[PDB]
């Protein structure tokens, strides 16, 4: 596979594994490394739990703009967003655009909870067709990116499918499906990661995850070439030791190579 050799190098010189896959909407052609193969989620769950948010607000009348008038009792490390408006209050919008473009932790926990947890998350990913994707646990237990621990993990191609379906397909009604795009847009976590591969003319919307412990960190994102069909990619890595560092740089590479690689 010589498609595949710059990826193995790639990974090599990182220590570890890295998964990729990427497909263009306008022709088909995809780009295919480890696409298959599970690797921890991290904080990259928060944009599918933003998606599934979104899916309830179109059934639950005024749902995204319910305030939620939360305690410390939900604030949880890294939670800049959710701490600066502890005395004034969210809204159920507000708190999922932290959780998108902050990756606010408390933000994602108070989202779960509206979902019915974890399960309630994996729930929702099932009925939009994914089979793969696997939410066990809250934020900041999901992180442990454990070796064959398959809880909290997906994989780089049934991330780019969901991701293609509630971005761009009729997953969730036309103003969902805008607003789940607008929040990827404005991401402020993902600078040095795919949207550093991606011509600077070219809009972006991503959500980052990471790990941290076991060289474990990823982006996925929807991309929109100047006057072409958008391509929706995804970059997962993990690495076998504890103390192993993820890399930003690696991923932008492979996000590189997978545009450089498509049809
Ligand atoms: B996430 O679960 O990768 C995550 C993100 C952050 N953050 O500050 O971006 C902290 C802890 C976990």
Same mark, same amino acid.
């Given at each position: 596979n010589?498609? %595949? $050799?710059?990826?193995?190098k790639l990974e !090599?010189?990182?220590?570890?594994?890295? /998964?990729?896959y990427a497909?263009?909407?306008?022709?088909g052609?995809?780009?295919?490394?480890?696409? &298959? &193969?599970?690797?921890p989620?991290?904080?990259?769950?928060?944009?599918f739990?933003? %998606?599934?948010?979104?899916?309830?607000?179109?059934?639950?009348?005024?749902?995204?703009?319910?305030p939620?008038?939360?305690?410390?009792?939900?604030?949880?490390?890294?939670?800049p967003?959710? $701490?600066?408006?502890?005395?004034?209050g969210?809204?159920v919008?507000?708190?999922?655009?932290? =959780?998108? !473009?902050?990756?606010?932790? =408390?933000?994602?926990?108070?989202?779960?909870?509206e979902? /019915?947890?974890?399960?309630?998350?994996? =729930?929702?990913?099932?009925?939009?067709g994914?089979?793969?994707?696997?939410?066990?646990?809250? &934020?900041? $237990?999901?992180?442990?990116?454990?070796? /064959?621990?398959?809880?909290?993990?997906?994989?780089?191609?049934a991330?780019? $499918?969901?991701?293609?379906?509630?971005?761009?397909?009729?997953?969730? %009604? %036309?103003?969902?499906? !805008?607003?789940?795009?607008?929040?990827? @847009?404005?991401n402020?976590?993902?600078?040095?990661?795919?949207?550093?591969?991606?011509?600077?003319?070219?809009?972006?919307?991503? @959500?980052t995850?990471?790990?941290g *412990?076991?060289g474990?960190?990823?982006?996925?994102?929807?991309?929109?070439?100047?006057?072409?069909?958008?391509?929706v990619?995804? *970059?997962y890595?993990?690495?076998?030791?504890?103390?192993? @560092?993820?890399? &930003?740089?690696?991923?932008?590479?492979?996000?590189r190579?997978?545009?450089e /690689?498509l049809?």
């Amino acid at each position: 596979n010589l498609v %595949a $050799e710059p990826f193995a190098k790639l990974e !090599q010189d990182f220590g570890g594994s890295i /998964g990729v896959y990427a497909m263009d909407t306008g022709s088909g052609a995809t780009v295919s490394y480890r696409a &298959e &193969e599970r690797f921890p989620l991290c904080s990259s769950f928060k944009g599918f739990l933003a %998606a599934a948010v979104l899916a309830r607000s179109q059934q639950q009348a005024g749902l995204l703009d319910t305030p939620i008038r939360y305690g410390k009792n939900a604030l949880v490390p890294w939670s800049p967003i959710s $701490e600066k408006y502890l005395t004034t209050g969210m809204t159920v919008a507000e708190l999922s655009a932290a =959780a998108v !473009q902050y990756s606010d932790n =408390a933000a994602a926990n108070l989202l779960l909870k509206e979902l /019915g947890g974890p399960a309630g998350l994996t =729930a929702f990913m099932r009925s939009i067709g994914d089979t793969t994707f696997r939410l066990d646990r809250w &934020e900041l $237990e999901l992180n442990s990116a454990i070796p /064959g621990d398959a809880r909290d993990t997906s994989s780089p191609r049934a991330v780019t $499918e969901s991701l293609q379906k509630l971005t761009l397909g009729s997953a969730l %009604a %036309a103003p969902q499906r !805008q607003q789940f795009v607008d929040w990827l @847009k404005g991401n402020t976590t993902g600078n040095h990661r795919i949207r550093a591969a991606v011509p600077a003319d070219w809009a972006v919307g991503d @959500k980052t995850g990471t790990c941290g *412990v076991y060289g474990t960190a990823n982006d996925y994102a929807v991309v929109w070439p100047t006057g072409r069909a958008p391509i929706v990619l995804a *970059v997962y890595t993990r690495a076998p030791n504890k103390d192993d @560092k993820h890399s &930003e740089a690696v991923i932008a590479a492979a996000a590189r190579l997978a545009l450089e /690689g498509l049809g």
